[PDB]
Amino acid sequence: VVNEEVAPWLDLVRKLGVLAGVLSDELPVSLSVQVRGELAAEEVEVLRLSALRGLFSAVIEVTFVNAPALAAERGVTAEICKASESPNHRSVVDVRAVGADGSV
Amino acid sequence: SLPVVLIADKLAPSTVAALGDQVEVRWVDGPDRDKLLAAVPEADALLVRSATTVDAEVLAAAPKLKIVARAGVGLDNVDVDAATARGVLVVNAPTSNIHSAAEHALALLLAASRQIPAADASLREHTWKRSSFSGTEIFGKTVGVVGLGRIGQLVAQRIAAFGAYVVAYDPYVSPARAAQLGIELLSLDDLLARADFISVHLPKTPETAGLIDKEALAKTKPGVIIVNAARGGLVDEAALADAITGGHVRAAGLDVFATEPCTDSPLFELAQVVVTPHLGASTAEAQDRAGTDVAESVRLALAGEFVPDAVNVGGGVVNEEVAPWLDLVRKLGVLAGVLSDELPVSLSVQVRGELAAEEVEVLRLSALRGLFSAVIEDAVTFVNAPALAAERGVTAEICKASESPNHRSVVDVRAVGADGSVVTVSGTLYGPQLSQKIVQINGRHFDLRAQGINLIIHYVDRPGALGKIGTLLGTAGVNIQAAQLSEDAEGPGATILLRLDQDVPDDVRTAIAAAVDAYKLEVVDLS
Amino acid sequence: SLPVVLIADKLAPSTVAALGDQVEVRWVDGPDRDKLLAAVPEADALLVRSATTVDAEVLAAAPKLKIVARAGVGLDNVDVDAATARGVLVVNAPTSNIHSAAEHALALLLAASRQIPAADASLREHTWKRSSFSGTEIFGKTVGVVGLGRIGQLVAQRIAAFGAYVVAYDPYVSPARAAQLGIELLSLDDLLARADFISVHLPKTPETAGLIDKEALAKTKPGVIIVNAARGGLVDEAALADAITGGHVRAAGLDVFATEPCTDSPLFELAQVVVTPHLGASTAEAQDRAGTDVAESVRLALAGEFVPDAVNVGGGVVNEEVAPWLDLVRKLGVLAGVLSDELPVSLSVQVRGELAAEEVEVLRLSALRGLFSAVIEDAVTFVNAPALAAERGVTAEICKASESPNHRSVVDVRAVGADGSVVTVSGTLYGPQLSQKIVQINGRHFDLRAQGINLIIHYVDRPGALGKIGTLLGTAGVNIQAAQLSEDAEGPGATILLRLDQDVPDDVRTAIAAAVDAYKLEVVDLS
User: Fold this and answer.
1) Torsion of CA C248, C253, C255, C260, to 10 degrees
2) Inter-chain touch B418–C422, beta carbons under 8 Å
3) Residue C52 near residue C9 (C-beta atoms within 8 A)
4) Where does NAD(+) bind (chains B, C)?
5) Does B180 touch chain C (CB under 8 A)?
6) Any bridge partners for residue C143, and if so which?
7) Of the candidates B57, B6, B99, B75, which has an alpha carbon nearest to the alpha carbon of residue B382?
């Protein structure tokens, strides 16, 4: 069960992955999803899947158990972090894409 | 161990008797630097007039100083920033000169209408030139009061008993307050057109400086008598001389000069202009009151009580959590006032989220300080809310809510109009540096630095408007640092706010207004 | 010799501990007449709840009585006229039930939306009829508050946290006050059209009685739930039943009845109508507060201090010179309110001539009492000005002047609008009988009894207007006792005021308005 607090973020975090991908010059070698604030008390694994899926749609002609194997075979490692501490927003999700050349 | 109150200028023990028997009062020759610096280390309070300068050197040398009290209205001789910087409460006596100044304005108006000095001079030269003089009668005439603060109000009251009709210009008094005074509020242009006498009662702010220039003088009624016992320069000195010489304004009275000491004004060569060396408060009664006022402020302050006449913030007065919010909230007040069509009758300050757990009454005062900046002089930070409410007709309240919708803390300033309309502006602070951010205006959200010159436009012609505006601005050489724009949720309108690196010349503002068919165009400096 | 405080109803010593140790507190069985009458001769103060009747007999029997205090809101059991007649201060606890009443309105709204009683009954009959019920959700809905006094304000605050949008109807709250509350002020018609829920919070005055009749019920939204925990009859009981039965209003909640005790209402035969036997204040907390409130009022009163919660005037409270002016000035407030386009933001009371030498602050309260009569219940004479200002947004001031232009004394009431417009009405007293006279309205002078039914018309079509009006009135059978009329000094308008022997039917008012092309037509009873 995706928690009621988490469900509404799925689509947002997908769009963040879309954005991070299109805004990346090269295909990223890594994707990092950082959950901060109140949301960080929830189960948010599924937000990593959403990001990745946003990342890859913005690049490839993509489902939820599809994307981790697609990511692997495109050499994109993912990562998810959770921290209660958010400096401004009550809850915020950051999607970070790093390219082969070290660009962010 | 009795607290030490050091008096560094000429204030009599009797003048300062409001201090209890619970203090040790000492005197020093303040103007003598060596004496002062030797006496101040032991001082818990320092009272001063105008002759002693309370700079950083003095403050650094006074390790237990809790209050600097200036027995007067001006704060030129006190570095209020340094005092705040070291947690020292600064106080003045803000209403101590009001009757003496009002009376002096009237003195100058009568002295000019009836040529008292010249006449006195003729008799002083042992001749009788009665046939030469011709005065002007006040009864039945219209008197324009430019600025309706406390003093302008007293002048209107006194002049009204002469049978004069009183009109006033002051965008910073509510219409209901003016109506309670029985005074008709007018545009400046209309006051100029109507007034047989003009008395100026503005503070000096760049909003105010040289307000009555040649353009203005030319709109007045032929035969006007004009008095300025307010601030040097409110009436352009050279333009006055021109208008006096040309005959259009019959007479004037001045107590204050663009720069003083003033000994070389051309106005001094004109008989029809009565002049006095800044005497408006030169009265035993006003100097005594300045002292007894400030003696009471110092008592309250030493009694850990609340100090209405405070000018700044110093001491426990404010938490570390709250302190950084003061300046942001001041800027929200400025903004809510600029975005308003007319003076709101009140400000509602809503404090939401984490900040709501704090003691935040001072934030209500910040908002008001911001709203009224155009009639407040820079040094002052705090203003007396009850006095503001009674004098100008505007109030403020604070409301707290546990929840802030988005940011962990937000402050919303609601400026409410007499007709029940509302203008809302919000800010937060966040980050290691606690940068001040404007985050909402009237239901539109964004994130813009609360700083610099900001241009705000409400307008109706939408397509290509961004291009038109940015192109006009950039042709004028104006850099656009940041921007926020959105089409109204309901209606034909749209709005945009831009941070610029400089002000916008009037012609270009006119061009922009024309280009996008603006109904509101404002430029506000949030620094 | 310690002052005697007699408690004649069930108030605990602890409830009344706010009385000092400087009084002797005794108890009596108030409802027992013999006991009461035997105990009261020694009483300096008398506290009572609802069970003891404080009539003239009681008062005549209590020669040193200074205060009658009612621990509650109603004054039905006290003859306030007789008490005033004998110089006895009467006090109540005017805000003691506000939270319990607000909570009960909410209780009734929820109980009706979710059919709590019926549902509880089904389970009480040992059956499970879950499928039968269908409730109504408050979130996102519009809630109409009819009357925005203190309690209506609390209800709006509580209901707003349910995510409901709040609108209100109250001609007696300023637009700026409503905007500070974040509430949209509406015409009654517009509230009716928009509201999914209606909560009534009016006082009972003939301005108010049966406000929501069949005509009104028919304007509401299909599916409305309507609550009245205010006053019996505000919503027409039979019209409600009709609308409930017909289905148009889904549910209702009532705590009060056109007449109570009520045991036979048809509404009691309707499941979709939740009913409670006037329980709004039936709370230990509200009864305790009523007591501690009134215990403090009695302390202040015995301390020769000022009694905010006073309901009338008694004792030194007012000079013999001033006393007769109270009722005149109340009538000036009524008049200034009627002649105003909307609620003034303030009243300026000017006292001029001989009366100016008197202590006349109470006159400021009279004016306000008059202005607000439509939302004040008859027994009350004094109202709490600070509370009125905070609750409804209207203030009053007094100004004195030595000179009255014509009469030896005159009082002018200036009603000032938020836009700075002003309505002025003046009266005097003179003569062996001190007859009350209205002597000015808006710069027009005359001499008319301040009494009876007065019709006031501002109108634009002038020639033969006197004939048209007097002919319509006299065809309706209406006698015209006195009259004052004049053509405006500037403009096409004219005005007339007439004292009539009866009210004017609506159709004839419509006819008169039509006949002279009126822009304002009002009928006010000044008795």
Assistant:
1) 30
2) no
3) yes
4) 150-151, 170, 229-231, 255, 278-281
5) yes
6) C166, C197
7) B75
